[PDB]
């Protein structure tokens, strides 16, 4: 008889899950499995993203229970738990979604060899990205496109992505009863207290496939807002109702299908002939994700500078006093500190909000390496994607893809064009709630009586600016200008 395991890593969903459909096909027992390393906390990982993961597992648990099955959260290492459950459960087939990250290629190649020793068939369909990223490389001639213009031309030559897979049946084959490695007390979904986190999460974005689909339908209630979506024209200061979809945490963990997102967009574009085109359209945003996944998966040492063939070797400064002030949201610029506060509290910021803080830290003001600010992003971002977190930090630091280092955002003026009152600043930095809008972006310019009347004395309640932007940016641009000549 057929006993199969559907291994969940990414793709924490039931819709558009071809690895789950194959696992349930002609199966006597199906074992939904998610492997947890309990000593992750003892390695870097905020409670916001980890609890977002735990909520997505509880969402899978309720979905399997409604279909007569159950999710199994196995503790330990995968190269270790699988050889035991193969012989215990009488496994004949193992299915999981294809992953192109550097750690996964090592991990999955080890489980395949263990599955070959136990006589277990391995089926790894592709469903995390829009296309087969290795197929796009072969169709381009053996190398990945290095520009968005060339990559957009490539996917149009290939055509539409595969349609989202059918939904799984209403009744799934249950796991076998009285199996020791499937005991409910040792396979349940733990909370954030039991994994070792002492401070609770503060994000307002709840994980799970159900919330992802509800957040999808809400974005598609106005098809005219979807058809005319232009990314550079959105508001980074919009926090009550974010100007974009905020679907990145669900696309990272796989709670939402990229092919399902793509399909619904084409249904709206079909009825709106004047819809926006890449790279500014909503479809173009999924292409940015697909473009950076294709380049990073085929480029050695992509998340670093040394050994990276696409990254420029820049003479970044090793300044831990500027990195600390930027990391702890105490640079003295309320626009920068408010965004960094949203990073630690919500774990998500608007794309242009991530532009202002990444530019200020790197080529803009502080001239600190993009690898240092990345590690801060990989800790607090609930949507942190290995490949996407890289290319954008190399984009903002002018190390790759982007080479216009003369374009420097102003930490004082940038947020002013969207939010002259400073409503975004007063929310995440409540020490400046009473500061008048005239000095809310430059509090050090307010008279001392204005600082006292507002209860925000610069140097006592709110820090002074760590740098003069005019002097810092002028030096940073020039240093970046000679590095490009030596290139
Ligand atoms: C320094 C820096 C770091 C970043 N790190 C991450 C990261 O770790 N994870 C991440 O998902 N995005 C990252 N981005 C990209 C971008 O900021 C987010 O994808 C976007 O803010 C998500 O909001 P949204 O879901 O509303 O996107 P929308 O504008 O609604 O776009 C929809 C989807 O398209 C994709 N997308 C959008 N913009 C980009 C982009 N620039 N590059 C790649 N894919 C994109 C995402 O999957 C997103 O959910 C980073 C950008 C910068 C500048
Ligand atoms: Cl500006």
Q: Which phi and psi angles does 29 have, rounded to 5°?
A: -140, 135
**Interhelix angle for 370-380 vs 334-345, to 10°?**
40
**Specified resolution (Å):** 2.0
Burial (CB count <10 Å: 0-12, 13-18, 19+), residue 273: exposed
Indicate the SS3 state at residue 122.
strand
DSSP 8-state assignment for residue 130: S
DSSP 8-state assignment for residue 9: S
What's the gap in Å between 392 CA and the centre of ligand 1?
A: 9
What's the gap in Å between 415 CA and the centre of ligand 2?
A: 8
DSSP 8-state assignment for residue 464: P
Indicate the SS3 state at residue 421.
coil
Which segments are annotated as binding site for FAD? 231, 244-248, 285-292, 348, 351, 354, 383-385, 389, 392
CA atoms within 13 A on the CB side of 372: 22
Q: Which phi and psi angles does 7 have, rounded to 5°?
A: -85, 120
Give the strands of the sheet with 93-96, arranged side by side.
Answer: 72-75, 29-36, 3-7, 93-96, 121-123
CB count, 10 Å around CB of 482? 10
> In the chain, helix, strand, coil percent, each to 5?
45, 5, 45
266: left (phi over 0), alpha (psi -120 to 50) or beta: alpha
b vs e for 380-408, b when ≥16 Cβ sit within 10 Å of the residue's Cβ? bbbbbbbbbbbbbbbbbbbbbbeeebeeb
Which segments are annotated as binding site? 231, 244-248, 285-292, 348, 351, 354, 383-385, 389, 392
What's the gap in Å between 293 CA and the centre of ligand 2?
A: 30
- Mind listing the domains of the chain with CATH numbers? 1-127 (3.40.50.620), 128-164+209-299 (1.25.40.80), 300-485 (1.10.579.10)
CA angle, 234 then 237 then 243, to 5° = 40
Indicate the SS3 state at residue 12.
coil
- Contacts of residue 161, defined as CB under 8 A and 6 or more positions apart, other chains included, come to 130, 131, 258, 259, 262
What's the gap in Å between 351 CA and the centre of ligand 1?
A: 6
342: left (phi over 0), alpha (psi -120 to 50) or beta: alpha
Report which protein residue has its CA nearest ligand 1's atom 8. Answer: 384
Indicate the SS3 state at residue 52.
helix
Ligand closest to CA 278: 1
Chain breaks in the chain (C to N over 2.5 A) after: 43
Q: Which residues pair with 122 in a beta bridge?
A: 94
Contact of 196 with 246, CB cutoff 8 Å: no
CA 91 to chain centre: 33
**Interhelix angle for 258-269 vs 282-297, to 10°?**
140
Pocket of ligand 1 (CB under 6 A): 231, 244-248, 251-252, 285-286, 288-289, 292, 350-351, 354-355, 358, 377, 381, 383-385, 388-389, 392-393, 396
Ligand 2 is a single-atom ion; what residues have CB below 5 A from it?
A: 409-410, 414
Indicate the SS3 state at residue 462.
strand
**In whole angstroms, what is the distance from residue 341 CA to residue 323 CA?**
15
Pairing, β 29-36 against β 121-123:
unpaired
21: left (phi over 0), alpha (psi -120 to 50) or beta: alpha
What's the gap in Å between 407 CA and the centre of ligand 2?
A: 8
What's the gap in Å between 411 CA and the centre of ligand 2?
A: 8
Ligand closest to CA 242: 1
Structure tokens at 267: 């249904």
């Amino acid at each position: 008889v057929k006993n199969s395991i559907i291994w969940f890593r990414k793709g924490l969903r039931l819709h558009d899950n071809p690895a789950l459909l194959e696992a349930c096909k002609d199966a006597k027992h199906v074992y939904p499995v998610f492997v947890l390393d309990p000593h992750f906390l003892q390695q870097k990982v905020s409670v916001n993203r980890y609890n977002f993961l735990l909520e997505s597992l509880e969402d899978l648990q309720r979905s399997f229970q409604a279909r007569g099955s159950r999710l199994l959260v196995l503790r330990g290492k995968p190269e270790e738990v699988f050889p035991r459950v193969f012989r215990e459960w009488g496994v004949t087939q193992l299915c999981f979604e294809h992953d192109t990250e550097p750690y996964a290629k090592v991990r999955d190649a080890a489980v395949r060899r263990l599955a070959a020793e136990a006589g277990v068939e391995v089926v790894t369909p592709i469903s995390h990205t829009l296309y087969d990223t290795d197929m796009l490389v072969a169709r381009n001639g053996g190398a990945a496109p290095l520009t968005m213009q060339s990559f957009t031309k490539l996917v149009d030559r290939v055509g539409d992505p595969p349609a989202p897979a059918p939904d799984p049946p209403a009744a799934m084959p249950p796991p076998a009863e009285d199996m020791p490695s499937a005991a409910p007390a040792a396979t349940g979904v733990p909370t954030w207290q039991e994994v070792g986190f002492k401070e609770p999460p503060l994000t307002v974005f709840k994980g799970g496939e159900t919330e992802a689909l509800a957040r999808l339908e809400a974005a598609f209630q106005d098809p005219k807002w979807v058809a005319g979506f232009q990314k550079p024209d959105t508001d980074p200061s919009a926090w009550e109702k974010p100007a974009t979809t905020v679907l990145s945490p669900y696309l990272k963990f796989g709670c939402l299908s990229a092919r399902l997102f793509h399909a619904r967009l084409l249904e709206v574009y079909r009825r709106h002939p004047a819809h926006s085109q890449p790279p500014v359209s909503l479809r173009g945003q999924l292409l940015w994700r697909e473009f950076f996944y294709t380049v990073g998966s085929t480029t050695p040492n992509f998340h670093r500078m040394a050994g990276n063939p696409v990254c420029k070797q820049i003479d970044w400064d090793d300044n831990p006093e500027f990195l600390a002030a930027w990391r702890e949201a105490r640079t003295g610029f309320p626009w920068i500190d408010a965004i960094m506060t949203q990073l630690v509290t919500w774990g998500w910021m608007h794309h242009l909000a991530r532009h202002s803080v990444a530019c200020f830290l790197t080529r803009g003001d502080l001239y600190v390496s993009w690898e240092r600010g990345m590690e801060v992003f990989e800790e607090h971002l609930i949507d942190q994607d290995h490949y996407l977190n890289a290319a954008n930090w190399m984009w903002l630091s002018a190390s790759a893809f982007f080479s216009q280092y003369f374009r420097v955002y102003s930490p004082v003026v940038f947020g002013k064009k969207y939010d002259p009152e400073g409503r975004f600043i007063r929310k995440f930095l409540p020490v400046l709630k009473d500061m008048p809008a005239k000095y809310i972006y430059e509090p050090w310019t307010a008279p001392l009586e204005v600082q006292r009347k507002a209860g925000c004395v610069v140097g006592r309640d709110y820090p002074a600016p760590i740098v003069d932007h005019a002097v810092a940016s002028k030096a940073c641009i020039a240093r970046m200008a000679a590095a490009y000549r030596r290139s």
